[PDB]
Amino acid sequence: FVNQHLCGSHLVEALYLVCGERGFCYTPK
Amino acid sequence: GIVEQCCTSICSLYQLENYCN
C-alpha cells in the first residue's frame, strides 16, 4: 500500500497503518 | 512536506515513517 500516490484520506490511512500505536503528524503545507 | 513526497509524487515507507511520532 505505501508505494503509490497517496492523497487525502488515503494518505492519513497509510500513516495510520505504518505508524501504529506511535501515532503521527499529517501536515499539508 | 508530505503531500509533495507522497501525494503529488509516489510515496515510500522511508518517507512515511518520518511522520510517525
Residue numbers in the entry:
A (entry chain B): 1 to 29
B (entry chain A): 1 to 21
Structure paper excerpt:
The crystals belonged to the cubic space group I213 with cell dimensions a = b = c = 77.9 Å with one monomer in the asymmetric unit. The dimeric structure was formed by applying appropriate symmetry operations. The crystal structure reveals that disulfide bonds were formed correctly with no disulfide scrambling and the two monomers were linked via a new disulfide bond formed between the introduced Cys in position B25 of each monomer. The dimer was found to bind with markedly decreased affinity compared to HI (IC50 = 0.0012% relative to HI in the same plate, n = 3, SD = 0.00008%). However, significant improvements in stability of B25C-dimer relative to HI were demonstrated by markedly slower processing of the precursor with ALP, an almost 40°C increase in Tm, more than 44 kJ/mol increase in ΔH in DSC measurements and no fibrillation in ThT assay. Our results underline that the dimerization of insulin is responsible for insulin stability, while the monomeric form is required for this hormone's activity.
Insulin, a small peptide hormone, is crucial in maintaining blood glucose homeostasis. Insulin consists of 51 amino acids in two peptide chains, the A- and the B-chain. It contains six cysteine residues (Cys) forming three disulfide bonds, two of them link the two chains and one intra-chain bond is found in the A-chain. At micromolar concentrations it self-associates into dimers.
